[PDB]
Amino acid sequence: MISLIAALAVDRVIGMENAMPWNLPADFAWFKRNTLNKPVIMGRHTWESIGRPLPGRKNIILSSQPGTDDRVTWVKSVDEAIAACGDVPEIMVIGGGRVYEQFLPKAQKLYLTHIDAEVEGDTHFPDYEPDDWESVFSEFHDADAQNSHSYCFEILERR
Ligand SMILES: NC(=O)C1=CN([C@@H]2O[C@H](COP(=O)(O)OP(=O)(O)OC[C@H]3O[C@@H](n4cnc5c(N)ncnc54)[C@H](OP(=O)(O)O)[C@@H]3O)[C@@H](O)[C@H]2O)C=CC1
Ligand SMILES: [Ca+2]
Numbered sequence: 001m002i003s004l005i006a007a008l009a010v011d012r013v014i015g016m017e018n019a020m021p022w023n024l025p026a027d028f029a030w031f032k033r034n035t036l037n038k039p040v041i042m043g044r045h046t047w048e049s050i051g052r053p054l055p056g057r058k059n060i061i062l063s064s065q066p067g068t069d070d071r072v073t074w075v076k077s078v079d080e081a082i083a084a085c086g087d088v089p090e091i092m093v094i095g096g097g098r099v100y101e102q103f104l105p106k107a108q109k110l111y112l113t114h115i116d117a118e119v120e121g122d123t124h125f126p127d128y129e130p131d132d133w134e135s136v137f138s139e140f141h142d143a144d145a146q147n148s149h150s151y152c153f154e155i156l157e158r159r
Contacts, residue, residue, distance in 0.1 A: 002082070003109035004093045004100055005034060006125050013121030015096060018049045021119040026147045034111050035092045039085040043099040047072070057092075060084050062099060078102050097123040104128060110156040117149045134159050 007027050008014055015021070039058040042050075052071075053059040059072040060081050067074030075081045085091045093103045104126050110133065137155035141147070 001089065001109065002091045002093060002103060002107045003111060004103060004107050005031060005111040006095060006100060007031075007113040007115055008125050009115045009117040009119045009121070011121075012125040012127070013119050013123070014100075014125050015123035016119065016121045018045060021121065022115055022117045022149060024113070024115060024147050024149065024151060026141065026151065027113045027115070030111075030113060030153055031094075035094065038090050038092045039088060040092045040094045041081045041085070041099065041103070042094045043096050046094065046096040046099070058085070078106070082106075097125070101126045108158045110154075112154045112156065114152040114154060115149050116151065132158060 006014055007020065007022075007024070009022060013021075035054070036056045039060060040054055041060045041062065044061060044063040047059075047061045061067065061069075061072050061074050062076070062078075062081055063074060064076055073084050075084050082091065090109075093099060093107065110128070133156040135154055136157050138152060140152040141150060143150050
């Protein structure tokens with residue numbers, strides 16, 4: 001099963017100049033808990049933004065060109081990316097915008113963090129069809145001393 005995990009600010013903004021333009025440690029804990037011990041697929045720009053493999057996860061990088069780092073597994077197509085994960089219960093697609101768009105039609109689950117932040121961005125999550133998805137988990141949190149925005153963790157399953 002293929003899942004997408006993403007954090008979305010107002011208007012589905014996910015990124016600006018190769019970063020996530022907000023401060024939300026609660027989302028790091030959610031991301032780690034839901035990706036650890038699962039393979040993660042990401043695009044080259046997202047890979048370049050992290051600089052080092054995510055520990056405890058098989059890191060698969062999509063790029064049309066030959067790989068440049070043997071600490072991760074490089075693939076040249078969506079189907080090769082999926083194949084490189086082998087037979088696992090759940091594959092996690094972790095971004096960015098262009099990768100999310102291509103995996104959305106193949107995904108059965110979305111893990112979304114909806115962040116109440118107004119941010120300018122140059123990257124947005126795809127415009128998913130709400131009727132195709134059932135919300136199976138939704139937990140809202142107010143801002144606190146560590147998290148400067150309110151946020152809501154949501155899991156949606158494809159109907
Ligand atoms: N808010 C969030 O949850 C997250 C946000 N982000 C943000 O997303 C942004 C990056 O997204 P974006 O610019 O769209 O880039 P991506 O991270 O999606 O990487 C795009 C690159 O991946 C490669 N690629 C993608 N699809 C394929 C394919 N089918 N075959 C071969 N190679 C492929 C290409 O590399 P090549 O050019 O080498 O061919 C392409 O240029 C950043 O701002 C980042 O901070 C990232 C992850 C999470
Ligand atoms: Ca806010």
